[PDB]
Design a protein around this ligand. Sequence first.
Ligand code: CLA
Ligand code: CLA
Ligand code: CLA
Ligand code: CLA
Ligand code: CLA
Ligand SMILES: CC1=CCCC(C)(C)[C@H]1/C=C/C(C)=C/C=C/C(C)=C/C=C/C=C(C)/C=C/C=C(C)/C=C/C1=C(C)CCCC1(C)C
Ligand SMILES: CC1=CCCC(C)(C)[C@H]1/C=C/C(C)=C/C=C/C(C)=C/C=C/C=C(C)/C=C/C=C(C)/C=C\C1=C(C)CCCC1(C)C
Ligand SMILES: [Cl-]
Lengths: 37, 34, 451, 35, 49, 143, 29, 137, 24, 75, 31, 334
Amino acid sequence: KLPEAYAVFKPIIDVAPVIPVFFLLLAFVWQAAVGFR
Amino acid sequence: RIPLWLIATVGGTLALTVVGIFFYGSYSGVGSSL
Amino acid sequence: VAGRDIESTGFAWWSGNSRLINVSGKLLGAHVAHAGLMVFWCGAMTLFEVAHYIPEKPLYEQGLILLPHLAVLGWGVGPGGEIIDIYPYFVVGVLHLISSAVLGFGGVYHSLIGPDTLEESFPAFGYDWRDKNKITTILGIHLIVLGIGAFLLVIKAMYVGGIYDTWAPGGGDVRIIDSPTLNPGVIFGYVLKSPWGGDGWIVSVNNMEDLVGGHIWIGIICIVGGFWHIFTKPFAWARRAYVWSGEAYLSYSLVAVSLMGFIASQYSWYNNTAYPSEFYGPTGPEASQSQAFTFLVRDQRLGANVSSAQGPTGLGKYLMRSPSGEIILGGETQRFWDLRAPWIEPLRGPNGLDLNKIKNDIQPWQERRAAEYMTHAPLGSLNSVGGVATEINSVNYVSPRSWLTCAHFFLGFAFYIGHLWHAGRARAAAAGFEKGINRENEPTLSLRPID
Amino acid sequence: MFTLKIVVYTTVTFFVSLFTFGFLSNDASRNPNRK
Amino acid sequence: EGTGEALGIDDTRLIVPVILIPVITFILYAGFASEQDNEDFFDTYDQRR
Amino acid sequence: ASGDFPKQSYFGAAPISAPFGDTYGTAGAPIWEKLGETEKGIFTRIAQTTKDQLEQASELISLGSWEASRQRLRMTMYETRKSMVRLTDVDGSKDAKDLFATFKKKLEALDRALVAKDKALSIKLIGDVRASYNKWAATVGGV
Amino acid sequence: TFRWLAIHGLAVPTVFFLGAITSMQFIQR
Amino acid sequence: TDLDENTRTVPLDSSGTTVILTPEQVKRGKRLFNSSCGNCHVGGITKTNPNLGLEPDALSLATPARDNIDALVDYMKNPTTYDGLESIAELHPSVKSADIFPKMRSLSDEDLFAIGGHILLQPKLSSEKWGGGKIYY
Amino acid sequence: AAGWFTGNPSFGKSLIEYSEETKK
Amino acid sequence: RPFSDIITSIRYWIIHSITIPALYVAGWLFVSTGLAYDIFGTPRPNEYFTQDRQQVPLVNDRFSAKQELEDLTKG
Amino acid sequence: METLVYVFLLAGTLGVIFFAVFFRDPPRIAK
Amino acid sequence: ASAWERFCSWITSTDNRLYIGWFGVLMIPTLLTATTVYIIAFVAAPPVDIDGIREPVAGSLLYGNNIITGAVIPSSASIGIHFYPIWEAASLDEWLYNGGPYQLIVDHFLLGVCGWIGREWEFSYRLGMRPWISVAFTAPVAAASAVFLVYPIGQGSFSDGMPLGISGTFNFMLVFQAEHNILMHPFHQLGVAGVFGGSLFSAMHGSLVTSSLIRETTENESANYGYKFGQEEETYNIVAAHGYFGRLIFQYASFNNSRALHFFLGLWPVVGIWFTALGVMTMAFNLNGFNFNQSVVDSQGRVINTWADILNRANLGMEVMHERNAHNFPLDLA
Ligand code: CLA
Ligand code: CLA
Ligand code: CLA
Ligand code: CLA
Ligand code: CLA
Ligand SMILES: CC1=CCCC(C)(C)[C@H]1/C=C/C(C)=C/C=C/C(C)=C/C=C/C=C(C)/C=C/C=C(C)/C=C/C1=C(C)CCCC1(C)C
Ligand SMILES: CC1=CCCC(C)(C)[C@H]1/C=C/C(C)=C/C=C/C(C)=C/C=C/C=C(C)/C=C/C=C(C)/C=C\C1=C(C)CCCC1(C)C
Ligand SMILES: [Cl-]
């Protein structure tokens, strides 16, 4: 478990490892924003 | 009038949310061994 | 839009990164941002493991894959591979996560607002893919950096705390590797060993002295090679034997990294020294030999003479001879007779498992370890139902060894495919027919017909 | 057994060396677009 | 098998072919190599044979 | 039966089929405490047996058996480090911890000698290991 | 209305069944 | 049928007294059984020693009889052989041997009660599955 | 020039087609 | 007219901010009401077995199938 | 004796493959 | 003007009937050795003790097998994945007793198909054609390495690789399903999608190209002769087929672009077979298909069976009956 002083931030750390997947997805939205140049 | 990229973004987000709710129901309640 | 559309580049959005080949600064930003992604995942995932780590179960039963690495490096683990403290894991996680912010800022900078090409504003960093000397200097700098990393592992094992030796006298423990083996005949004896059964190539490291000494050798090799490449240019035999373009270099890196992926997968599957079974769980051979050991102890306790007991087919039910004659555990564990683990070597003599030790001196801790490793075999489903395929849904478990091995075998094969794609494209583009066959000068029509 | 071993080693080394020094002999140039 | 010999070389005889056959192939390759224009070039590959 | 609504919980931990909540530490304080009667007895037994194991290691060294001598230090001694840690913490003494570390380093050096097949250094180091273990034994007391 | 008929014959059962399925995830035995 | 009290009533002591487990108790017992001993005792069997399973026939014929909550709970702290003559606390998970069995360290008296309730509740759920093995999967 | 139109004059032609060709 | 031309139209979304969620919730109350179990005969989690019916129910005759179905599903 | 028939059939298939590879109708461009 | 240069020109010659090239230098001897040893061992080879329990299994025609039952038996389980060439055997007879020919054939054949991948790349470079036919070939090769090499490595025995026969192939299938539940494993499902879709798209593409052939042929003549080899014009109307397929389903579904169509044709089966080869590679290390056994329980908590349970019954029958004499302990951990 996290150190006591940090356990309150568990719900953020629970979503923390998964952001790289979103980065890939963000790329597509960016290319969707410029209409797939 | 609504940019289709935003429509696609929100629609895919909602569809992925529905499929994830299906996945949760797969790990919870009836259909789960627990 | 210039340099970022199919009209001005000839690359579609789905080959979008192919527009970065000749844009050196923007490509630098791509690399640095992706390195930020890597360190971000490291920090976030190890923080996730720390948050989900319960002090009751062992690491291998909780689905933890990263904290085992830090435990092996010698942080927050006591004798017997018992994780006593998990604050250094938190420190490593926060350090990686914070460094990810800096690397992400650098990558986004160089990608978006930094100079497109570094070859006019920063000639020291700018390069051309066809300029062999500059590319070799960059390669040599990175080789020196890799050697520094190897020496960092050496410093950790030798001076700063030391690493976890599972083979240590008594139980496995964190100890200083004061005398690494620097003999070339051992370190490069591993490199020239065969990969087949009993040999294992470099997966067969059975002690930390060889590991640390060969990391010293790798550090020396890499630093010497980096200084060699900084002050040298490719020789004529090399200059005619390679395609000198960015895609070719990418394909070379892809094949190397695919080979590394395969080797790492088998490291996690078979090795239990750099991947101790008390952090990553039993190997498959370890679990099978543990089943045989548990039932040997049970039946011996119940009056059977295990050495003289005959199985259905005439072979030993518990103990038999390997094809080379060594006394080994029987049954379908006969294939896994090459297992060597710190819990079973104690009963091993020169000619195999000593029958006197096997009969009179099996300790209770060995039976406990064998039962634990039997019940925690690498078998499991994709939805993490531990046991054989025909088991029921009560045990939620897949070994970290299975996850790591399968993932890295997958990525190794995928990166071999990537190598094949990129090497073929590099050759075709260098020769100049990666877009199609020229209708004007078709080579086949000039060729004489066969038959 | 050893005779078969050395014969197989001879054959394997022969073909591997041919492969090695053949692809090292400026194989990239052997394309129809050269010159 | 499973002994750990380097390249399976348990007998010293095995080395004679393993080292010499590449050397004869290397000697034949050197006649090709010495005939080539071995100066540098600025291209993705060498078009001179 | 004919109009009975299915049960429905919206991410609730109350239902029997809900996966939320911890499995351990929910229904009371643990029965187990560190250094109980049976576990202290087990560690005491292991520490007492380690003397004989060391003596057998010295005998194997004297006879030149290298595999058996190495395995003697990991056979009935694989729990020596944990037992010594647990009893040293009971003692709570600096000199006990120093002798503990000294025994560990001497044992590692003895192993490094045994792989080298150095008979003289092996004999010297098993003697030193036994002396250090007996010193720690007299220190922590009860063994 | 044939376009309406086809697309909505596909759609209306689809959304109805998806709502039923998302509810069915919560039956909780 | 619901998880009625007829299913949830299990023998408590050796004399014959019964106890009605609560749904929280059986839920916690199932979770604790699957987490602490499922690896060897999935399905009411014993992977390491299949001669002695958790089916009610084996528990009833044990010495002392282990077909009740108090006897099971005592086994979880003072485990013995099938004839009750030798202590196997060094080879079995017990709360008194939790340092060498780190899964039993967090269990309380109520946790042991719930685990025993799960064990005694299972055979009522299936005619032969609990302790039956592959033949009834 | 390479020679793809010689060596097998009946290739890709049926009996009737090649027969009518050979009779011009 | 083309599909994207309809989807980006505001009128489309004024219609389908109300029409689609209505039936998406209609399915929810279809099953939450327990109405599906009655129309389709599917046992609930507490109806697979009952007294004297601790075994699997099976129809063993073609023509009296309705009769034994009521007999088994008397509940 | 069936091994004779099996071997003959497999050898005949291999022979058909050989003759198809090496005695094919040569492709030529029509005019 | 040097002997090595002439040799390299001959090896890399586009005038040989069959292209050799540098990858062919490694392929032809290896593949020929594998073919020779396979033919000799299939027609005549003594029984092999596959399971390491001194219970030889016959696989050769001369020992009472037909073409369907014949096989080159996998190596003995006693060997494991130790290298077992002829020179590591005390005699050739005991080399054949423990299934050494399987190791020889598998190693040479795997090297040969790797050489085939490289040789496909090579010819394309000489041709000036684009690469990647080689990349498509990898998917079949990957599956072959998964079954012949990676599965022994993960399980730790060459006895576990697929037998080089027809009935042995079925045996390997049934044991794999019993031990890993490959059917429920999603990568095998992707492979099934790959092969079924490959058949579907092959039939569809052939049907539409054959259906819209331009009239270039008389009634007493095969339509195939309407196409002349090396012609410049298209032999069929892409517009007609595209419009027909658009009316068949809807306009947007059809591939109006031919290059995209053929990329999709090359993509679907290659990716499917890549995925199933990778699935076998991962189940080599015992990451099995899904296990939904006893996933539905009533309110009391007793198991209501599903189709997963009934499939589990077949898997369990195969599990108990496979290798009846080889297992001495209840778990099939090896
Ligand atoms: C690891 C993932 C990765 C990375 C590092 C990059 C990086 C890059 N891509 Mg991209 N790309 C990716 C995946 C990735 N790509 C994928 C998956 C696709 C397929 C859809 C593409 C498709 C693609 C195309 C089609 C093109 C690029 C281009 C580029 C380059 C220029 C970006 C630009 O100017 O866009 C401008 C983008 C924006 C203004 C949108 C905003 C993006 C923001 C900055 C992201 C936020 C990140 C983070 C939250 C910020 C943290 C800040 C920090 C201080 C904490 C850049 C180096 C371009 C190129 O080659 O140019 C020469 C280009 O044309 N990429
Ligand atoms: C792959 C890595 C990489 C590379 C090759 C480059 C290359 C470049 N960057 Mg930089 N950059 C990077 C990462 C990288 N950057 C990152 C991660 C960031 C985010 C912090 C930035 C942010 C950044 C900015 C904001 C700018 C550049 C610019 C430049 C250019 C000039 C560099 C210069 O003047 O150095 C000078 C070097 C220094 C000042 C560093 C001195 C060393 C300090 C004291 C640290 C010491 C560390 C120590 C040795 C480490 C011990 C290791 C131990 C733990 C083992 C050059 C093209 C400039 C540019 O392109 O302008 C148009 C520019 O303005 N970069
Ligand atoms: C990232 C690492 C790296 C990279 C990319 C390169 C790249 C290069 N080096 Mg090398 N080099 C490196 C590190 C690296 N070097 C290091 C650390 C050293 C040690 C000091 C050297 C020493 C060195 C020298 C002395 C020379 C090169 C040269 C070259 C060029 C030709 C490479 C070649 O054809 O190899 C060919 C490789 C072989 C023929 C086989 C290698 C032999 C080993 C011992 C094989 C052992 C078997 C192995 C274990 C089998 C399994 C491996 C498995 C992973 C598949 C090229 C620019 C040449 C040049 O032009 O320099 C200016 C040259 O003469 N390098
Ligand atoms: C989704 C992407 C992904 C993810 C999440 C991972 C995750 C992982 N990979 Mg990786 N991997 C990937 C893709 C990915 N991989 C791909 C595509 C490949 C190519 C096929 C590989 C190939 C690969 C290999 C070859 C290996 C891994 C391994 C690992 C694990 C350890 C990471 C690590 O430390 O690397 C190494 C980290 C670095 C190189 C960064 C620098 C490290 C520095 C130098 C260390 C300094 C240490 C020192 C003691 C510190 C203190 C200094 C001082 C105080 C004394 C981890 C589970 C390892 C494993 O466990 O495999 C079974 C492993 O061996 N991966
Ligand atoms: C070191 C890693 C590396 C690097 C730096 C590059 C770099 C590049 N690749 Mg890539 N590539 C890699 C690994 C790498 N590749 C691997 C491992 C493969 C084999 C699978 C490929 C296969 C590949 C192909 C086929 C092509 C490229 C291309 C490119 C260029 C543009 C890619 C782009 O913009 O994507 C933008 C990103 C996206 C559109 C996101 C796509 C995400 C996919 C759909 C998810 C994965 C699907 C599935 C699971 C994969 C199964 C793979 C199988 C083998 C197991 C760029 C130079 C293209 C090019 O133009 O080359 C010059 C090109 O045609 N690459
Ligand atoms: C201090 C502390 C205590 C307790 C735990 C806790 C976690 C809370 C911890 C806090 C940690 C914090 C606040 C860490 C901060 C880290 C941050 C902000 C990290 C950010 C990293 C940035 C990264 C990767 C950026 C990479 C971006 C990339 C590639 C972008 C890609 C792209 C580019 C460049 C162009 C085209 C579009 C596309 C493809 C999207
Ligand atoms: C670090 C460590 C940890 C555990 C203990 C251990 C002792 C193992 C210790 C030491 C490990 C050591 C020293 C590892 C070193 C590994 C080495 C040297 C690996 C060698 C890899 C070399 C490879 C692929 C070379 C391949 C090169 C090729 C095709 C070059 C190209 C070409 C050639 C040669 C001819 C044909 C044409 C082409 C394709 C252009
Ligand atoms: Cl067995």
